[PDB]
RNA sequence: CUCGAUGUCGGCUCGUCGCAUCCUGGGGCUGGAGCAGGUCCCAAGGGUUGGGCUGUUCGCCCAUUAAAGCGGCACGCGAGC
RNA sequence: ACCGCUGAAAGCAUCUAAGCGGGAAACCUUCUCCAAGAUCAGGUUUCUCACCCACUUGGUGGGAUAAGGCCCCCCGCAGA
């Protein structure tokens, strides 16, 4: 994951899930995986 | 017993009890009535405001004594002031007859 | 003058509140109420008046879930580091006596009274209590009025 | 207020009643029948229950 | 069950061991001598049994340990030690005038032996906590051995707890484990510890069976 | 539109609510279910499931797929069959059912015993691919990715034991 | 604040706490073939050496090392040197 | 931290809302040591138990001792 706590979609696939407490994104590609805080 | 009303506060008295109530305008032996707030023969109350100006409450003044000597020494701080007066609240002694 | 607190002038009656469902807040209030004796108008601040308290069932108090994983229980050791840190949920699976009894004895005053008066709170995880020698009534709590 | 918890109502309200009933007693002597006479202070209480008006509004 | 015993120890010795080794070696005699009184874990929640050993006359004791012993049944001991068990009574492992002998300890099966230690006195921060204590030449006025510092200066405006000083150190019961028995003399009582035990020769010593393995 | 499917059974067995909480016995053996109190489970007079609570507050709809789901979950499973197919792709594995149990082995000593749990089942076909199966989907599945995240995932061969693939990602190589 | 005194640097001795983790522990991503490597997440329990030049912290270097942390506490610590 | 199953709202997809599982030298355990002044001052067991005076009978003081312990003395690889 990269943790960048200003959480955006990267490519048209990322969907801006939230998952208990932190918001985390998936694209289903760990390319990035980001999540933020 | 009666809550009697004097000197702005309210004393709890039946017959026969003394009570160390204000300076009351009175000498020995002469008699004082002094109106009440709540009059009670232990199960019938008295309550109604108009029914409480007719229960008069009374009693012989006696003894007009003095309180106790109140001593009061003000002092602030640094300051450097000091301030000491007393004090003797005269009183009167009170039996009620009511 | 009063007349109500003086010489062997109080009352001991006593009190068994099932802790079965309550939260433990309104528990600790009530039974912290009923211990140092404002349930009784013959009351003051200098002498013990007041019932022996006893909490059963505190095994099942209620407290929020999302509390028994997060309020912490901290109790300091003096020794550099030796700080306790403890969620009410291990606390709870271990002593449940332990966080209802915190919770009152932290309601009362914080005085030498407060001690003598905390001597009177029994708690119990499970229904049954061994203070049955004499006649526990059970006090169960009741907002009152306005 | 505690004779009042005993009487089911709070000391708000026997306050409001003893006050709209107008018995002009004080705190104190209203304690000291509270603690010698039970019964005093039971007629009292219902004083100021027959003497609060409705309801939370007014 | 965790199978100890008590007994004393009497002295160190070297033994040559099988693949032609030494052996640094405490002999401990934890001899025949270990009778019991057993703890269950209903009346008082241990699960633990009383062993008993030593010899003393009647007079040499007094009134409640003689009753606890003739209770017992057994004739009185001058130590009188305690073993936990289990989270079990079992009720056949043990019995009340039951005899022990240093023969359990099946010469291999480690032991941790327990025992109070030898009084190092009322020894400073050096022999107490090995402080590699302050210089010795260059200019070092009086503070050789010395402590040093206790602390900072404004914060902990005090000494925090259990900061290492000086304090008679010593007797605290000690437990070195995995004390592999050489040899078991149940042929004149003593019990051969490949190691050193904690304590005065000649002194109680708690032999237990290890719990590491 | 998501209250538009009250549960059928084939079976017709134990649907029936005891007191807030479901169970169903037939082809397999029985389950349970806790079921939060602001949901609502009835029964169809032809003896079918039917579901609802006429609470709309946003919680209602959270529990109402759930609890559909998991109700399906439940007798559907007990009658039709949970079992999921699962590939070992890559080199060396050859199963043991010692018991009725597992044995892996892939690219290291020490072939691991997958402990046999009670309520499960373990199934093979080949010796790169097996399967298993039981009456509790998320007992299942739970199993399934026990199975799985052995050999974390590599993309630059594929060592997966996969849920019949479902695409593995590949390399950069070198 | 302290001037009718709060003894200043470095070293030593003794610590102690923080996490902004050097190592050891678990991980995600990797433009990660393997070795590794680089970056991000969690993690403070331990550990974090010896010398040469310098009053020197600062450094540079030698030989290592698992690694040879970065800080706080009157730039901790002189009624302890 | 991260991983995961079941799974909606939001006919899907999701580790999450209900649920369950993995998960580390970090937390409680496990171990070693202190420890009931833990005044909430614990427990199992054993031992001794009239024991004589005076009052205001009594309690209340006294005195006598039981069991026990101490002080003395000989010591200690226990210790200022």
Redesign the pocket.
């Known amino acids: 994951?990269?943790?960048?706590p200003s959480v955006k979609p990267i490519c048209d696939k990322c969907?801006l899930?939230?998952?208990?407490?932190?918001v985390?994104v998936?694209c289903?590609?760990?390319?990035?995986?980001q999540?933020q805080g | 017993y009666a809550i009697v009303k004097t000197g702005g506060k309210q004393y709890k008295v039946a017959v026969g009890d003394v009570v160390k109530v204000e300076k009351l305008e009175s000498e020995q032996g002469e008699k004082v009535s002094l109106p009440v707030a709540l009059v009670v023969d232990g199960a019938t109350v008295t309550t109604d405001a108009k029914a409480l100006a007719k229960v008069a409450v009374t009693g012989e003044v006696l003894g007009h004594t003095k309180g106790p000597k109140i001593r009061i020494h003000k002092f602030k701080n640094k300051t450097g002031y000091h301030k000491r007066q007393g004090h003797r609240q005269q009183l009167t002694v009170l039996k009620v007859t009511g | 003058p009063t007349y109500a607190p003086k010489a062997g002038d109080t009352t001991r009656s006593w009190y068994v509140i099932d802790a079965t469902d309550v939260v433990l807040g309104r528990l600790a209030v009530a039974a912290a109420n009923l211990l140092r004796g404002k349930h009784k108008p013959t009351f003051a601040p200098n002498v013990d008046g007041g019932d022996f308290v006893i909490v059963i069932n505190a095994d099942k108090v209620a407290i929020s879930?999302?509390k028994l994983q997060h309020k912490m229980v901290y109790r300091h050791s003096g020794?550099?580091?030796?700080?306790?840190?403890?969620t009410i949920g291990?606390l709870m699976q271990?002593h449940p006596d332990?966080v209802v009894?915190?919770a009152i004895?932290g309601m009362l005053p914080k005085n030498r009274l407060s001690?003598?008066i905390?001597?009177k709170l029994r708690v119990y995880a499970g229904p049954e209590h061994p203070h049955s020698a004499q006649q526990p009534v059970p006090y169960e709590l009741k907002q009152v009025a306005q | 207020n505690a004779a009042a918890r005993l009487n089911d109502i709070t000391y708000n309200r026997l306050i409001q009643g003893l006050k709209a009933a107008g018995v002009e007693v004080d705190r104190k002597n209203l304690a000291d029948i509270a603690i010698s006479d039970p019964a005093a202070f039971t007629a009292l209480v219902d004083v100021a229950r027959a003497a609060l008006p409705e309801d939370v509004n007014a | 069950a965790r199978k100890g015993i008590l007994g004393t120890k009497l002295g160190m010795t070297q033994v040559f061991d099988e693949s032609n080794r030494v052996v640094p070696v405490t002999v401990v005699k934890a001899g025949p001598n270990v009778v019991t009184?057993i703890?269950?874990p209903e009346?008082?929640?241990?699960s633990a049994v009383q062993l008993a050993y030593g010899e003393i006359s009647p007079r040499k004791?007094?009134?409640?340990?003689?009753?606890?012993?003739?209770?017992?049944g057994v004739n009185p001991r001058r130590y009188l030690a305690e073993l936990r068990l289990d989270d079990s009574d079992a009720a056949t492992e043990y019995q009340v005038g039951q005899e022990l002998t240093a023969e359990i300890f099946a010469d291999g099966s480690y032991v941790?032996v327990?025992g109070?230690?030898?009084?190092?006195?009322?020894?400073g921060?050096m022999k107490r906590?090995?402080?590699?204590?302050?210089?010795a030449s260059?200019?070092?006025?009086?503070?050789?051995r010395?402590?040093?510092?206790?602390?900072?200066?404004?914060?902990?405006?005090r000494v925090?707890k259990?900061?290492?000083?000086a304090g008679?150190?010593?007797?605290?019961?000690?437990?070195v484990?995995n004390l592999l028995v050489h040899k078991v003399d149940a042929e004149n009582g003593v019990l051969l510890i490949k190691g050193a035990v904690p304590?005065?020769?000649?002194?109680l010593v708690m032999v237990?069976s290890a719990?590491?393995r | 539109?998501?209250g538009?499917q009250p549960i059928p059974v084939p079976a017709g067995v134990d649907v029936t609510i005891e007191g807030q909480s479901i169970s169903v016995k037939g082809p397999k053996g029985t389950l349970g279910l806790?079921?939060?109190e602001p949901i609502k489970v009835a029964r169809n007079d032809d003896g079918a499931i039917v579901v609802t609570r006429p609470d709309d507050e946003?919680?209602?709809?959270?529990?109402?797929?759930?609890?559909?789901?998991?109700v399906?979950?439940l007798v559907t499973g007990v009658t039709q069959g949970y079992t999921?197919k699962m590939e070992i792709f890559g080199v060396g594995y050859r199963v043991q059912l010692k018991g009725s149990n597992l044995e892996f082995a892939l690219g290291y000593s020490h072939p691991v015993v997958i402990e046999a749990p009670e309520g499960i089942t373990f199934a093979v076909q080949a010796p790169t691919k097996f399967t298993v199966s039981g009456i509790?989907?998320?007992?299942?599945?739970?199993?399934?990715?026990?199975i799985?995240?052995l050999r974390?995932?590599?993309?630059?061969?594929g060592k997966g034991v996969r849920?019949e693939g479902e695409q593995i990602?590949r390399?950069?190589?070198?």
């Open positions: 994951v990269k943790v960048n969907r899930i939230r998952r208990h407490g932190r985390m998936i289903s590609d760990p390319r990035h995986k999540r | 879930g999302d020794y550099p580091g030796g700080l306790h840190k403890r291990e271990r332990r009894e915190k004895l001690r003598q905390q001597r | 009184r703890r269950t009346r008082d929640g241990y004791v007094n009134k409640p340990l003689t009753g606890q012993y003739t209770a017992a941790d327990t109070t230690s030898k009084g190092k006195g009322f020894a921060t906590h090995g402080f590699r204590g302050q210089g260059h200019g070092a006025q009086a503070v050789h010395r402590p040093g510092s206790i602390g900072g200066c404004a914060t902990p405006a925090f259990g900061t290492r000083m008679r150190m010593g007797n605290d019961r000690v437990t484990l304590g005065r020769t000649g002194g237990r719990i590491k | 539109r998501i538009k806790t079921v939060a946003r919680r209602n709809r959270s529990l109402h797929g759930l609890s559909r789901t998991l399906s979950n999921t509790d989907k998320q007992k299942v599945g739970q199993i399934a990715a026990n799985r995240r974390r995932p590599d993309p630059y061969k849920y990602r390399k950069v190589g070198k």
